[PDB]
Amino acid sequence: GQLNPESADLRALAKHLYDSYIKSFPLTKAKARAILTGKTTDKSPFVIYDMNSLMMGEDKIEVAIRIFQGCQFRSVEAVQEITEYAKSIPGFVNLDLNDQVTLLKYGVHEIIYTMLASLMNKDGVLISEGQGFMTREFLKSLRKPFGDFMEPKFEFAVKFNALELDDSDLAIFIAVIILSGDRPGLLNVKPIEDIQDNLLQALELQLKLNHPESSQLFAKLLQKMTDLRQIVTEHVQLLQVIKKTETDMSLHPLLQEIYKDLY
Amino acid sequence: SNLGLEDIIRKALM
Ligand SMILES: *c1ccc([N+](=O)[O-])cc1C(=O)Nc1cncc(F)c1
Numbered sequence: 001g002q003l004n005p006e007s008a009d010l011r012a013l014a015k016h017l018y019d020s021y022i023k024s025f026p027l028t029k030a031k032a033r034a035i036l037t038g039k040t041t042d043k044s045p046f047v048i049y050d051m052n053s054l055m056m057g058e059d060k061i062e063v064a065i066r067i068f069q070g071c072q073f074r075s076v077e078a079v080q081e082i083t084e085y086a087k088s089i090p091g092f093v094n095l096d097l098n099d100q101v102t103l104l105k106y107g108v109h110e111i112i113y114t115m116l117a118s119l120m121n122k123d124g125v126l127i128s129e130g131q132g133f134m135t136r137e138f139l140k141s142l143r144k145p146f147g148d149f150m151e152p153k154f155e156f157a158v159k160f161n162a163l164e165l166d167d168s169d170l171a172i173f174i175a176v177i178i179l180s181g182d183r184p185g186l187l188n189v190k191p192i193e194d195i196q197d198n199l200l201q202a203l204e205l206q207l208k209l210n211h212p213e214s215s216q217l218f219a220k221l222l223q224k225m226t227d228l229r230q231i232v233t234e235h236v237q238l239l240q241v242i243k244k245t246e247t248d249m250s251l252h253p254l255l256q257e258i259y260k261d262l263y
Numbered sequence: 264s265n266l267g268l269e270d271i272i273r274k275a276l277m
Binding site: 076083101104105 | 272273
């Protein structure tokens with residue numbers, strides 16, 4: 001590596017994306033980690049870890065289809081923020097509009113799961129705008145099919161969070177996800193790969209500068225896209241599990257509202 | 264939904 005005009009341009013791109021990311025996403029990874037590690041004394045979340053504490057937290061808060069309808073509605077803001085971020089990626093708004101929509105309609109789910117990992121640690125997930133913390137084992141204990149909804153996302157998040165990415169890293173990673181030339185139905189793949197090539201160069205440099213501890217972090221991070229893609233693909237099978245579940249699927253109303261905060 | 268999601272994205276790109 002040398003400090004030359006192209007490397008400076010890649011640093012300017014990384015900065016541009018970081019600044020846009022801060023402007024687009026009010027809830028950053030740093031803010032979420034500060035809550036999770038016990039430093040946002042302004043907002044100490046209530047811990048929901050069993051049915052008893054679930055009822056004690058009442059003031060702070062088909063069934064499964066209604067959950068999905070509700071979490072999709074609550075994710076509209078995230079979709080809008082991700083779309084606003086995408087407009088800042090140099091070259092993106094010059095693409096064929098159909099390709100912009102295609103890139104976003106596939107990319108937003110992978111990006112939402114990436115951002116969900118910031119809200120998670122091995123014990124649980126922030127909910128209710130950081131005012132609450134829902135434990136992983138309590139979610140896992142819930143009757144089928146609900147108890148299986150979130151555990152694969154926790155498994156992913158622990159592995160993903162072990163990379164110790166910060167918001168500057170994530171800004172470039174999210175842009176790389178958006179500019180994926182492999183999305184089905186794309187009309188003009190080459191201009192998308194031209195931008196992604198630039199973003200990948202910027203990510204590779206960002207990770208080398210920012211993570212001296214982690215020699216193949218670029219490759220490990222790109223491999224995390226396989227897990228993101230698996231989780232997204234599986235959501236179609238959650239829908240089939242629900243159709244075929246002959247059992248009772250009632251769920252405490254407050255648990256229904258907590259699930260609407262998830263994805 | 265997919266059609267609902269596409270419409271959200273299209274409006275947001277406006
Ligand atoms: C919303 C709320 C809770 C869950 N969950 O516990 O699994 C999932 C969802 C949901 O609708 N997820 C989703 C929606 N559209 C696309 C996806 F890839 C995932």
